[PDB]
Design a protein around this ligand. Structure first.
Ligand code: ZN
Ligand code: ZN
Ligand code: ZN
Lengths: 424, 135, 82, 318, 246
């Protein structure tokens, strides 16, 4: 009776969702997906609120159907939905030129939080959003700090403080970087001896643990000699200001301006430090060899070839013939005759997993039968102590297994306290 | 510069050893604490043996006699080192156990050293056997 | 002064603690030691929190059976990393 | 115009400021402000202006700065006063407190909410921290407690780690005064974490208070065992506190009393440690007494007096 | 009804007031009006010195809103009614020879919400909350409800004598505590709502002190005990004989 119609309407909703989400263009797919799911959810919630005075079971089945459909896993393919939603967030929060007032963005985000709540795989979306927010903050592509703070607050309300723990630290790092720069300027200005850096220095000091950026590459990039005084002075300032910390300069994320003024006044170019070391090495003569760049910039082969290719895209330097492949000559040369047109020239662009999941689920079930009641921390500790024999567990995987067993009616959350589990 | 783990481990062990020869147990322990964080990721067996020897020496210097005795005893079970080095590690373990505070841990260490058949060659086997028998 | 000078440099750097963890706050032994409990009578590893405080797994297990907070920052304890 | 054009205009602004000519300076500044607001998006130009007025403006020019601040405050109320008004208010109002800004804040607060009948957590916490600082300067303990409990209601804010330092330090101080050492410890730890993350002067004051709170809650766990507090363990202003903890934990009366006597004019001078030190030298004495009488079934009171350095009457009272 | 109540308050007639209240009790529509009328009837019952009606109305008021709003809502921000009813209940229980419950339900008062000087002044409120707690509360709950309570600190500094009495009694000091109790007894007897209940309370306090004085001892000197209790050895011996007998 009741379960039969509940099940049949659940399949009806699921098929309606698939039909709505199918036959969509691959270019604007995030926006269409978000809008379609939002309109379906709004229509269904209106239909169930206007009729029969709630009937909680109907929207419970609707939420279950949405949760099942959003985690639509293709054979061997990962769930693309969290990445899609993260890209939608990044596009909404970026500085588009088509209006996009702050109030409308906030309304869109607070409406989007509903479809966000169904992800159930929120760690992939969290990592994607963290990476894209880091890029946006570093490159200054955020249209408003208020919108980013509002989005982080909405995410915190949706899930919790622990979910938005690193993003809060990134936001505070951006907030305090300006104060750090002002204090560094005061420190160099108030020194007993005059300090002339020769460079207008602005830095973004970020938490290593909070930010996804890391010195994962083994690049041996030699520092340019002109801006070594800046790094030495800032290291001294940081040592005098914050005790017990160390600095690891991300040389692949720092940019800067090189000005040409005696070659016909061709305005100023803006390039990364990787693209600046080679230009500085070009000061010896118009033509240089790969050996000279290797000995000067001391960069790895991959990074150096990437820099050379990017320079060729700029047409800053060129090869006379088609001998730019892997060889020993690599006789690059300047192309000053191809002068710039603008001024800014702002260029900026598993079997083991399944085995571990099954082991964790079996361990959780066995422990829950052993105790018949436990707390979250005690359950996690017991699971770790039991499964440490084969592998080191990940807390995210343990929590996912706990959630999937709660859904499977193996264990239940206590009515009095939500952190207590009981075996059923 | 991002040095390799072996270079940092070797430099830390050298600094700890130099501070030990300077009779500076606190700085030796400070620079062995850094080495202990890198010893678990290095693959050099010689580096691990040197770190274990230096850690045992630091613990012995800090008058952590029972811990240094256990470290020396487990270092005397390593087949990589020479026979003389293993015997010296066993002798140091025996000396630290004799110098340790009387208790359950010290009694168990004394029993373990007595069960070893190589403790007879050490010059303190009589003291070891008299302390093992609660005499 | 030069032929192709540099005007501005927007640096990006990551700051981290020189020494993150060197001793469990509960057992007072080093974080790579045997937690003082496994030392006297015996796998001992590190168990981090949401505050990234890195106590011994056994020491924090014994602490959690009496107190629900982190020993250092006195905030609600949540497991992370192992 | 453009970037080079605006930079040239700023150079001319500097040049005209060099030769004073005050009326021209004011009307030029007003026209610049109006043009900037009416044409270009504020955010980036405003942070650039904020960075501009700190490198040259700090050198004396007190009356000119007062006039400029007055004119900016008067001419910025008409459009919006949210970007830089908070920081200039905190900077200028620390010393004077001329009793006027609070009045209009109270008037607008009464006007805004009750008349109409949190999405504003960050600015609410900022104004709460400003009120907390002013009331701390005025020594209003009850108002500080009320402000702390009122700010505790905000759970959707992302503030600067200096606001969260001020309010958490106020909470720790009020918890210390009331006697809740467990809450004071975590409040002071949070305040010190925020102050260390951003700041410098008010950093080795919440660490001392956190040390005192940790020692006042039966101790256990060294405060200088976390990442944040460890580098400042050997700080000249924290050496006394870390020695006090090293003596308190692993209790020994001699070391504690020697550190107290040596730093007679260093630690126990502010009314926060000097008031709470009498609770110490009693908890550590109690722990020493407990450890001493553990293996005994009958013990002489004069023996305990000799061991604890206190006389017979104090031993009996303890 | 409001004018009738005001006239009855300023006139003093109570029988017709009781008749009007009985007639109007059946007409209740809003909880707030019931609250005001319950407070008024509590005041008139206090004036009449009839505590059974006070207890019945207090119990009705507590049991009406789903067992006092279950566990408990956000603490008193501007609703000073709860402190007023707690103070009235404390006065009623104290006047009913029930000191322990009076202290229990009187200690839960706030200075910011005790600004009505028409039922019980802060000075005598602190006096009652100190004396009853000293006489009836054990050491643990006296520590956790008086010395540890920060809200009662304001009341204690309002009347420094009671604060000193409690602090000296708690810290095993009885000569000074009993001397100051005797000194303040004369002022306590001139009071209105405490005097008939003072003497017994005092004896209780003394007895408590006596017991506490022997709590940490297995052999005690009678001379030092008598000196600590401001009495001769013979009187102390008689008092301890009576205490041992019961
Ligand atoms: Zn430990
Ligand atoms: Zn262990
Ligand atoms: Zn913590």
């Amino acid at each position: 009776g009741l379960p039969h119609m509940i099940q049949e309407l659940q399949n009806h909703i699921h098929d309606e969702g698939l039909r709505a989400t199918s036959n969509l263009t691959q270019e604007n797919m995030p926006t269409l997906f978000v809008e379609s799911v939002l309109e379906v959810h709004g229509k269904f919630v209106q239909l169930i609120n206007t009729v029969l005075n709630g009937d909680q079971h109907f929207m419970s089945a609707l939420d279950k159907a949405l949760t099942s459909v959003v985690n639509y896993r293709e054979p061997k393919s990962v769930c693309k939905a969290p990445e899609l939603l993260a890209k939608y967030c990044d596009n909404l929060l970026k500085k588009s030129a088509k209006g996009m007032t702050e109030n409308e963005v906030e309304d869109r985000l607070t409406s989007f939080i509903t479809v966000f709540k169904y992800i159930d795989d929120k760690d992939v979306f969290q990592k994607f959003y963290a990476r894209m927010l880091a890029k946006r903050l570093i490159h200054g592509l955020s249209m408003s700090m208020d919108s980013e703070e509002a989005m982080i607050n909405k995410l915190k309300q949706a899930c919790g403080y622990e979910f938005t723990s690193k993003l809060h630290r990134m936001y505070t790092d951006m907030s305090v970087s300006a104060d750090l720069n002002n204090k560094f300027n005061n420190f160099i200005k108030n020194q007993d001896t005059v300090i002339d850096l020769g460079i207008s220095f602005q830095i973004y000091v970020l938490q290593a643990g909070a930010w996804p950026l890391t010195q994962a590459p083994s690049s041996t990039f030699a520092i340019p000699q002109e801006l070594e005084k800046s790094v030495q002075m800032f290291e001294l300032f940081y040592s005098q200001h914050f005790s017990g910390r160390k600095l690891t300069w991300l040389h692949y994320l720092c940019t800067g301006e090189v000005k040409m003024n005696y070659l016909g006044k061709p305005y100023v170019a803006m390039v990364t430090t990787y693209q600046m070391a080679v230009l500085l090495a070009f000061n010896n003569s118009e033509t240089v060899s790969y050996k000279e760049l290797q000995d000067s910039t001391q960069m790895n082969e991959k990074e150096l070839t990437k820099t050379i290719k990017s320079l060729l895209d700029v047409k800053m330097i060129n090869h006379d013939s088609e001998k730019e492949d892997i060889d020993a000559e690599s006789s690059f040369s300047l192309n000053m005759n191809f002068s710039s047109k603008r001024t800014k020239f702002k260029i900026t662009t598993s079997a083991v997993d399944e085995d571990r999941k099954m082991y964790l689920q079996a361990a959780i079930v066995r422990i829950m039968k052993a105790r018949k009641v436990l707390r979250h921390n005690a359950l996690i500790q017991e699971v770790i102590s039991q499964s440490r024999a084969r592998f080191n567990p990940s807390i995210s995987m343990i929590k996912k297994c706990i959630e999937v067993l709660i859904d499977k009616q193996y264990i239940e959350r206590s009515q009095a306290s939500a952190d207590e589990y009981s075996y059923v | 510069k991002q040095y390799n783990v072996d270079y940092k481990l070797e430099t830390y062990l050298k600094i700890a050893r130099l501070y030990l020869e300077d009779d500076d147990p606190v700085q030796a322990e400070a620079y062995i604490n850094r080495a202990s964080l890198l010893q678990n990721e290095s693959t050099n067996e010689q580096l691990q043996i040197h770190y274990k020897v230096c850690y045992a020496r630091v613990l012995d210097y800090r008058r952590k006699f029972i811990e240094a005795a256990q470290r020396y005893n487990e270092l005397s079970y390593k087949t990589i080192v020479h026979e003389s080095e293993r015997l010296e590690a066993l002798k140091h373990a025996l000396h630290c156990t004799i110098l340790a505070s009387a208790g359950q841990q010290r009694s168990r260490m004394l029993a373990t050293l007595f069960k070893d058949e190589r403790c007879q060659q050490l010059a303190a086997y009589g003291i070891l056997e008299k302390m093992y028998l609660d005499r | 002064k030069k032929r192709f000078e540099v005007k501005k440099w927007n640096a990006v750097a990551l700051w981290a603690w020189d020494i993150v963890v060197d001793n469990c706050a509960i057992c007072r032994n080093h974080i790579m030691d045997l937690c003082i409990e496994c030392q006297a009578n015996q796998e001992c590893t590190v168990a981090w929190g949401v505050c990234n405080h890195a106590f011994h797994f056994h020491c924090i297990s014994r602490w959690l059976k009496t107190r629900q907070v982190c020993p250092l920052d006195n905030r609600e304890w949540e497991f992370q990393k192992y | 115009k453009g970037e080079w054009g605006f930079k040239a205009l700023k150079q001319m602004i500097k040049i005209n400021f060099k030769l004073t000519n005050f009326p021209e300076m004011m009307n030029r500044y007003k026209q610049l402000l109006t043009y900037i607001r009416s044409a270009v998006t504020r955010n980036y130009s405003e942070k650039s202006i904020n960075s501009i007025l700190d490198y040259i403006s700090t050198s004396k020019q007190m009356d000119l700065l007062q006039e400029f601040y007055e004119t900016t405050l008067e001419a910025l109320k008409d459009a919006k006063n949210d970007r830089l008004w908070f920081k200039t208010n905190t900077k200028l109002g620390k010393l004077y407190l001329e009793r006027e800004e609070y009045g209009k804040l109270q008037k607008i607060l009464r006007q805004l909410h009750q008349s109409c009948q949190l999405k504003k957590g960050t600015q609410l916490l900022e104004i709460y921290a400003l009120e907390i600082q002013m009331y701390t300067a005025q020594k209003n303990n009850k108002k500080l407690k009320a402000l702390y409990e009122q700010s505790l209601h905000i759970k959707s804010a992302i503030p600067h780690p200096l606001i969260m330092g001020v309010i958490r330090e106020c909470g720790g101080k009020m918890h210390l005064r009331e006697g809740e050492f467990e809450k004071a410890h975590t409040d002071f730890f949070e305040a010190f974490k925020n102050y260390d993350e951003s700041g410098s002067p008010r950093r080795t004051t919440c660490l001392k208070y956190l040390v005192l709170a940790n020692m006042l809650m039966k101790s256990g766990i060294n405060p200088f065992d976390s990442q944040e507090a460890k580098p400042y363990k050997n700080d000249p202003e924290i050496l006394a506190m870390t020695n006090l903890v090293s003596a308190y934990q692993n209790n020994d009366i001699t070391e504690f009393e020697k550190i107290l006597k040596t730093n007679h004019s260093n630690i126990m001078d502010d009314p926060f440690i000097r008031e709470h030190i009498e609770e110490l030298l009693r908890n550590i004495r109690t722990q020493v007494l407990i450890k001493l009488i553990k293996p005994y079934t009958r013990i002489h009171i004069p023996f305990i007096s000799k061991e604890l350095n206190i006389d017979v009457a104090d031993v009996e009272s303890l | 009804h409001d004018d009738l109540g005001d006239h009855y308050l300023d006139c003093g007639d109570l029988s017709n007031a009781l008749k009007c209240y009985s007639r109007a009790r059946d007409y209740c529509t809003s909880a707030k009006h019931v609250i005001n009328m319950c407070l008024n009837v509590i005041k008139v019952s206090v004036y009449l010195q009839n505590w059974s009606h006070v207890l019945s109305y207090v119990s009705k008021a507590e049991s009406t809103p789903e067992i006092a709003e279950q566990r408990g809502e956000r603490d008193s921000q501007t609703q000073a009614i709860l402190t007023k009813l707690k103070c009235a209940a404390g006065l009623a229980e104290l006047a009913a020879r029930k000191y322990k419950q009076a202290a229990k339900c009187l200690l839960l008062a706030s200075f910011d919400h005790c600004d009505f000087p028409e039922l019980l002044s802060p000075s005598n409120v602190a006096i009652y909350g100190g004396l009853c707690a000293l006489a009836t509360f054990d050491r643990q709950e006296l520590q956790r409800n008086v010395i540890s309570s920060s809200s009662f600190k304001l009341f204690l500094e309002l009347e420094p004598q009671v604060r000193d009495i409690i602090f000296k009694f708690y810290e095993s000091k009885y000569a000074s505590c009993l001397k100051m109790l005797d000194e303040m007894k004369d002022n306590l007897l001139l009071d209105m709502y405490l005097a008939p209940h003072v003497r017994t309370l005092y004896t209780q306090i003394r007895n408590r002190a006596l017991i506490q004085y022997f709590s940490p001892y297995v052999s005690a000197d009678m001379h030092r005990m008598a000196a600590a209790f401001n009495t001769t050895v013979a009187a102390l011996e008689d008092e301890l004989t009576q205490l041992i007998l019961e």
